[PDB]
From a paper:
This highly active protease is able to break down mechanically important structures of the body’s own cellular matrix (e.g., proteins such as elastin and collagen), as well as proteins foreign to the body (e.g., outer cell wall proteins of Gram-negative bacteria). An imbalance in elastase activity might contribute to the onset and progression of many inflammatory diseases with an impact on organ tissue integrity, especially in cardiopulmonary diseases, such as chronic obstructive pulmonary disease (COPD), bronchiectasis (BE), pulmonary arterial hypertension (PAH), and pulmonary fibrosis.
Upon binding, the equatorial C2 carbonyl moiety of ligand 19 formed a strong hydrogen bond to Val216. The clamp-like ligand 19 fits perfectly into the S1 and S2 subsites of HNE, with both phenyl moieties perpendicularly directed away from the central core. In particular, the hydrophobic S1 subsite was fully occupied by the southern meta-(trifluoromethyl)phenyl moiety of ligand 19. In our complete series of co-crystallization structures we observed an induced-fit binding mode.
Author numbering: 16 to 36, 38 to 63, 63A, 63B, 63C, 64 to 90, 92 to 148, 150 to 166, ...
Write the structure that this text describes.
């Protein structure tokens, strides 16, 4: 997250870090005790058997007893189309069930087909890069963003920070966009580099996928 701020610790207990050899590479969202959802581009080409699913995290550079770690049992995809930047969602079934507590909670999803109007206020978040060269992030970041339809296709929810350069960045891939208390987005792609101040950030439109999601998690 570029130009965002540190989250209060465990403010977003559905927020997940996906990791390889102890290094974060992508965000995800706990949507049931034994399922997370993330971006399909996070796991394309990745050794899924080596992926660790980290719940209850805040500061990645610190040892944290609030943490629970799972492996991926199964992957569910929904037509990921990287050429057209479409259907950028996967569900990873875990090898066990999360222990739901103060630091680890299941996110709430919108109704199928819910649309977001121009001007909707959302929070993006993640452990992605902090700038062009500021560094990647230890502490979970969040960011106020506004839903926009200009320079956005119907097949995305897009957001733009007004009046300054800020936005999601590398490593924020697969992280939730929260709007009106619900996970409306999964960070999918940027244009013009991170925080261009021109192109909106694009997210997989979770509302479009809810019937598919419910079929899997129930
Ligand atoms: C392949 C790859 O690694 C990409 C990353 C990481 N991000 C990217 C970069 C910074 C932030 C984010 C975030 F997800 F957070 F929005 C994403 C991009 O933008 N990309 C587009 C490209 O490289 O052409 C890639 C991409 C390609 C296809 C889809 C689809 N559908 C999604 C992303
Ligand atoms: C689920 O997996 C947990 C962590 O497994 C570890 O990470 C994966 C990616 C592999 O590299 C593996 O060798 C590691 O042990 C376990 O700690 C946990 O017990 C598992 N739960 C089960 C089997 O129900
Ligand atoms: C910045 O964001 C704050 C928190 O956002 C609210 O709660 C999150 C979890 C989402 O549900 C989001 O849709 C809500 O807006 C807001 O309280 C605050 O007012 C925002 N400030 C500005 C100026 O945008
Ligand atoms: C989650 C959160 O902090 N939400 C706040 C809400 O409490 C407040 O009513 C509003 C003020 O406009 O800003 C938003």
């Amino acid at each position: 997250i570029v130009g965002g701020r540190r989250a209060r610790p465990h403010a977003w207990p559905f927020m997940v870090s996906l990791q390889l050899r102890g290094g974060h590479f992508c965000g995800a969202t706990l949507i049931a005790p034994n399922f997370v959802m993330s971006a399909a581009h996070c796991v394309a080409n990745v050794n899924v058997r080596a992926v660790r699913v980290v719940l209850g995290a805040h500061n990645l550079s610190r040892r944290e007893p609030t943490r629970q770690v799972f492996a991926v049992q199964r992957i569910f995809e929904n037509g990921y189309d990287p050429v057209n930047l479409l259907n950028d969602i996967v569900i990873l079934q875990l090898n066990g069930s999360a222990t739901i507590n103060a630091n680890v909670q299941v996110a709430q999803l919108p109704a199928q087909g819910r649309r977001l109007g121009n001007g909707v206020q959302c929070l993006a978040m993640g452990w992605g890069l902090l700038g062009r060269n500021r560094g990647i992030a230890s502490v979970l970041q969040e960011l106020n963003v506004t839903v926009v339809t200009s320079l956005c296709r119907r097949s995305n929810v897009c957001t733009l920070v007004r009046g300054r350069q800020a936005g999601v960045c590398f490593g924020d891939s697969g992280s939730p966009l929260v709007c009106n208390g619900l996970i409306h987005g999964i960070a999918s792609f940027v244009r013009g580099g991170c925080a261009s101040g021109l192109y909106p950030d694009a997210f997989a439109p979770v509302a479009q996928f809810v019937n598919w999601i419910d079929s899997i998690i129930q």
